[PDB]
Subunit: 332 residues, 3 copies
């Protein structure tokens, strides 16, 4: 009887940050209430000023990470304002029935809907828009995110001992297929509707023009680099709603990795690089042991360094010479 369960309202935060939550559940099952507003907006995705008409949940690419526990109910109020122009919906890979909720959440501009589902399986899961006949277009325009369903007793290593993270980041990787004129220059349109046929043709090449973390080339760099300290335990959730990726932390490892994102399975140990299939979210746990700059990339290095799939960590603390040292510095 759901009416006797506690409700809690959660305010979502922008990726790569994640809303406050408990790892180990401090209450019984709850109904967890989220609200998201669909926003169609112009987005600049690279250093050259290339613009697309992005389709977003809550104004970001990716949409925000939702975090609940196993056997909670998720209640999502989804709003499509009349300033938008397209029909949207939502599919949760975490849910059971009705095309992930897709069949029940079709909202024209000016409408809203409230969906509830029970989070029966623990893991990280992709969510994405999926309107009938325009699925790939919506998803490759940025309309995806992820939900994390924690086990009620938190994460465990391969021996069943507890694993507790000190920080958590969410990296959404996005393939974009920006349409090109005859010579190879990117086209510009005034509305999402204008791009449609050109977008279908660009997608059919199966060759993205950009692959980015958090919505733009270099979004997770400089002032916006991810941070941590030597000694900290960091969980990095990574999603790709459409295409395979292979994350790698340059200078580090995935100590414990659930490459396909599902926590009832034991994690893979000591990974250098792991494969997250398109349509999946994955999670990697690392303990930092050296200070300095780290690059976190898609290890198709062309996709990383030419097409944009690269971010940075800045890590503070003490250097350990036992682990690594320059014996003789570069010299004639």
């Amino acid at each position: 009887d759901i009416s006797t369960l506690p409700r809690v309202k959660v305010d979502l935060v922008k990726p790569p940050f994640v809303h406050a939550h408990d790892q180990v559940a401090k209450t019984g099952p709850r109904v967890v209430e989220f609200t998201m507003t669909i926003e169609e907006k112009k987005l600049v995705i690279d250093r050259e000023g290339t613009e697309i008409h992005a389709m977003t949940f809550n104004g970001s690419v990716p949409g925000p990470l939702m975090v609940v526990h196993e056997n909670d109910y998720v209640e999502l109020r989804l709003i499509n304002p009349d300033t938008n122009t397209l029909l949207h919906n939502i599919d949760f890979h975490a849910a059971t029935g009705a095309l992930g909720g897709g069949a029940l959440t079709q909202v024209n501009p000016g409408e809203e809907t409230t969906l509830r589902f029970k989070a029966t399986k623990p893991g990280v899961f992709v969510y994405h828009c999926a309107p009938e006949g325009m699925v790939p277009w919506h998803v490759t325009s940025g309309m995806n995110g992820a939900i994390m369903v924690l086990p009620r007793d938190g994460l465990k290593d391969e021996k069943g001992q507890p694993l507790t993270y000190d920080k958590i980041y969410y990296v959404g990787e996005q393939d974009f297929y920006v349409p090109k004129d005859e010579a190879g220059n990117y086209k510009k349109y005034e509305t999402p509707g204008e791009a449609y046929e050109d977008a279908v043709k660009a997608m059919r090449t199966l060759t993205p023009t950009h692959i980015v973390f958090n919505g733009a080339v270099g979004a997770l760099t400089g002032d916006h680099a991810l941070t941590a300290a030597v000694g900290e335990r960091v969980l990095v959730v990574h999603s790709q709603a459409n295409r395979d990726t292979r994350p790698h932390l340059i200078g580090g490892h995935g100590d414990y990795v659930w490459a396909t994102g599902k926590f009832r399975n034991p994690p893979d140990l000591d990974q250098e690089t792991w494969l997250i299939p398109g349509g999946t979210a994955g999670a990697a746990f690392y303990t930092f042991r050296q200070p300095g700059v780290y690059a976190y990339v898609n290890h198709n290095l062309i996709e990383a360094f030419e097409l944009g799939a690269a971010g940075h960590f800045k890590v503070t603390g003490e250097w350990n010479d036992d682990l690594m040292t320059s014996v003789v510095k570069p010299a004639s």
Copy 2:
């Protein structure tokens, strides 16, 4: 001494259906006899009427699922009628030696051959034609299928408890590389031999023009949708002889998944999406919990919805509101 083992003759059925078999072996080892006839035929692969010269085992793309038990002998009589024009053979990834049987099964039109091999490893395995110097062409023209070698005591979960399926389907996913003229229109030829150089050039782009389930765009829809009931346990075998795929059941999960198809390994639990590498068969077990329509896709959603890699389940029975419900229906 094989001459003292029972023989049994099996008549194969068209995919996605699977010939009758016992999960748990009710006899000792047997020699299991199959016959297949190679058929070269014209096939219409999409709604636009695009035609290819397909190369088939037993008249279908994919070829039929063979099912035996561990330590059975498979005896396959393979017939190439004189109405065909090419040399064919067969390679079983389930077999040991002679290039999977490839070296011993070369049959010109007008010839036949009988091969026997012991099924020493349990799992689902790809079989495909592989004639010297034309391997990719034959395989990407549709000349592949799969064999399932069950453990003698049937399937087990990750704890070793029995898993029994109520139904089994076989989904063969096929990449096609139909050659294009200067403007992007599909070419047509009178014979398989005519297409050869154009086919090599199309393949070298590494970009398929179609990716289909069971031989055509929309083959597993409408009247030909897969069916089940709430409560039923369904095994879905999925093969791709040449290219990576990432299956996903929209509205469901892979409860138990052997993504690389080999049953001595424990299954992965609660998968949203899994990666079946090119040249592999995989198997996913799901128990339906909600009625309605489900889409079963390759979750590169472009490959699914634009290039054809999408099928449907129609599931009958009772709706469960605890799992999912619309609290407030789409409204102003």
Copy 3:
């Protein structure tokens, strides 16, 4: 205190062969000294005589396999002679800190450097050059290899029992992106520097022109085929520094496979085909049971047979009819 540990100097050998080593460590921790000389050289990569300016560690593509044990120190003296023209460095995915050693190993032509790191995690790991702003170019020009860090007590099966290999081979798979003129012919340049902008454009297509084992089409064939005997236990280490691969032994299996290369994890059993993600090294153990020729391929069969990703084993010994036999040979 490193100064009291034994040192040992290892002379590296050309792939696919591997320097002599002990599986089970017969000493305590050591500092293991390697030297590599960077060589920029012209390389012919196919039967048509197509030439590239390759960037090599020690004159080969891939660079040589280094083999140490867990908790050894690796000390690498890396030399860039003044006959070269580019700045190079090295990143070890096996190491912790400073971008895998990348940050500490930048050597202009005429310089050398000596790096030391502790091999804290057991597995096979990729190493590759990664100079700031030219990472993909260096890696896809051939500047990668692998390091194997054995557990001190050698390899174990999924039950913890010892697995001992009789031979070990190293297969490096390389994607090349040779630039094409208007009509599709390969371009030629006098220096590496000349190709740069054309190389960036070729890479951005994400479509390689060649995919090879050991640096050329057909390098692991004929006189240079890998060999073994019926009964031998063979470890095949396989690396791809930039792009996904799916190895398959035609006529065989991966008895025990660590597809993502990390030995603290149990191996996957009875694999037909496995996925090694770009930026990873993997390892497969097989026991030969039949004599004859085997093809070892990337099982995207286009990549194998049209673009070059195929090698051979020649295996000697006794044929076993129980496993496989031709009952009726190809006949009218």
